[PDB]
Swiss-Prot record:
Ubiquitous. Fe cation binds at H182, E184, H270. Zn(2+) binds at C228, H234, C300, C302. Histone demethylase that specifically demethylates 'Lys-9' and 'Lys-36' residues of histone H3, thereby playing a central role in histone code. Does not demethylate histone H3 'Lys-4', H3 'Lys-27' nor H4 'Lys-20'. Demethylates trimethylated H3 'Lys-9' and H3 'Lys-36' residue, while it has no activity on mono- and dimethylated residues. Demethylation of Lys residue generates formaldehyde and succinate. Participates in transcriptional repression of ASCL2 and E2F-responsive promoters via the recruitment of histone deacetylases and NCOR1, respectively. Ubiquitinated by RNF8 and RNF168 following DNA damage, leading to its degradation. Degradation promotes accessibility of H4K20me2 mark for DNA repair protein TP53BP1, which is then recruited. Also ubiquitinated by the SCF(FBXO22) complex; leading to proteasomal degradation. This is Lysine-specific demethylase 4A. The chain holds residues 7 to 354 of 1064 of the full protein. 2-oxoglutarate binds at Y126, N192, K200, K235. It is found in: Nucleus. Changing G164A: Abolishes histone demethylase activity. Residues 8-50 form the JmjN domain. Residues 136-302 form the JmjC domain. Changing H182A: Abolishes histone demethylase activity without affecting ability to bind H4K20me2. The gene is KDM4A. It comes from the Eukaryota.
Amino acid sequence: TLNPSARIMTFYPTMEEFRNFSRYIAYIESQGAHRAGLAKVVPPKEWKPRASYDDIDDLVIPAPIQQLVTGQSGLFTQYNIQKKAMTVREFRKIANSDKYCTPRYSEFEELERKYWKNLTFNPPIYGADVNGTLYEKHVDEWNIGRLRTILDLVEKESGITIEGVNTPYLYFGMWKTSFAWHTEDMDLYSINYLHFGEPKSWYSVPPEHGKRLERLAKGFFPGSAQSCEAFLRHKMTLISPLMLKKYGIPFDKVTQEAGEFMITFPYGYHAGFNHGFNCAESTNFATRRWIEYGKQAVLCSCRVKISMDVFVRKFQPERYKLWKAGKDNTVIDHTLPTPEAAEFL
Ligand SMILES: O=C(O)c1ccnc(-n2nccc2-c2cccc(O)c2)c1
Ligand code: NI
Ligand SMILES: [Zn+2]
């Protein structure tokens, strides 16, 4: 529970360290960041992915979703109602209005209590999964739109576009909008940058304890678990930090403020909520460590699947026959950093 090996680390790279994305990820894994499932990276003060955000009031959010939550005793299920399209302007009006705005709070822990006490009431609207990017064309460091990781093999060799995985998504938040407990698609890494506005709070379970979270949820949602062997992948399940403490799931929390990146690691369960009107940009990425997580990922069996053949042939040609036949049973040690990190010791 308390073990700092599994606690969320924050990093403050210099501009020189920053310019190389894949290398900095390898560095933060050399320092154990991946054990927590989530890390924060504050960029160098000077760096700026856009001049300013005054000029986006006419951006269209095609499919805003109202987030209806049902439940009690810290277990909840989140349903989506697609609303018809609206602009950033229309969205900010609702968000900053008096029916939807951030309540009064002295500190994080007060706002958290109000979140878990009030998430079933007063359903907010989330401008989620908007295709696009808010970086200017000219930004070369940590550009969510083009990160140059090996994930690029899906598009380059397989010729496949997957929206929000291979491509960036924007998220327009408002108080009490939520992301439920999940790992990424195919258990990829993710990157999330908060462009502006109020903060985003995150909960994280270390990858070494993720199966504990799955067994908690199977047990609390037996119906869901019979229908689909990865029902968390549906992104409808909210579980409170008080339930996690109560059943001995270790977890950590952290708050992302405007201008910060969050990195999620393979098989890092995460959830959270936005404090008020904000905008984030995110996509998935991979390292060589990801490949084993990809091969082994348990997928939604009832409704994103990436073909691993390209990755195994390119990076594990020795193991390919064995893997195709069903014989490869490498076991993942979640503690080990990516091979790319050998240069740091
Ligand atoms: O909306 C977020 O702030 C957020 C944060 C972290 N991860 C997610 N992810 N990651 C993959 C897919 C989602 C996602 C996307 C849309 C709604 C949702 O509840 C979750 C979304
Ligand atoms: Ni995520
Ligand atoms: Zn399913």
